[PDB]
Amino acid sequence: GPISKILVANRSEIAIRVFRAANELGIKTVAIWAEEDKLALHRFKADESYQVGRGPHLARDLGPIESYLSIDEVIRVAKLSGADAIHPGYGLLSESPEFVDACNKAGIIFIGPKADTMR
Amino acid sequence: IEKGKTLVIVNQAVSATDSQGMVTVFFELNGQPRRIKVPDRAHGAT
Numbered sequence: 001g002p003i004s005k006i007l008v009a010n011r012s013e014i015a016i017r018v019f020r021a022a023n024e025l026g027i028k029t030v031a032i033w034a035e036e037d038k039l040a041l042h043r044f045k046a047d048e049s050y051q052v053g054r055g056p057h058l059a060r061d062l063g064p065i066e067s068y069l070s071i072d073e074v075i076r077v078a079k080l081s082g083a084d085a086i087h088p089g090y091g092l093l094s095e096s097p098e099f100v101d102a103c104n105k106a107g108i109i110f111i112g113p114k115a116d117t118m119r
Numbered sequence: 120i121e122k123g124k125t126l127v128i129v130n131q132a133v134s135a136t137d138s139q140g141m142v143t144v145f146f147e148l149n150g151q152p153r154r155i156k157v158p159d160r161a162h163g164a165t
């Protein structure tokens with residue numbers, strides 16, 4: 001099944017960069033945003049977008065950056081949105097093998113190299 | 120507005136009603152100011 005919806009597990013310029021590529025290729029896009037980024041540009045730049053880091057499913061509010069660093073939150077969003085692939089951009093969870101493994105686990109294409117490659 | 124299209128809306132202020140009997144509500148929508156004008160039916164205005 002060719003890649004049909006990408007979630008971009010990032011913010012700012014690089015989220016926006018990836019949204020452009022996917023969109024030019026005919027691929028739908030999902031953004032995530034923490035509460036502190038509820039007014040950020042990048043979140044209005046995707047086909048649809050969802051909040052990470054607060055709500056019923058969490059013991060406490062996640063911090064502004066911590067919300068983007070949560071593996072469970074990204075995965076939870078890829079499922080809720082029905083994304084088939086995730087772009088980590090740069091920084092954040094882009095060099096996490098625990099993150100790569102989580103994506104494998106849920107059958108979501110990690111747009112990056114294999115977990116063994118990151119170790 | 121839809122799954123995955125979240126508006127943030129702040130009621131900044133509400134004006135005294137004017138003559139012609141209009142009230143303007145000053146909102147912020149996703150950070151941006153927006154004024155909306157509504158009749159003040161409560162209080163007799165068309």
Ligand SMILES: [Cl-]
Pocket residue numbers: 062063064065066067
């Ligand atoms: Cl934080």
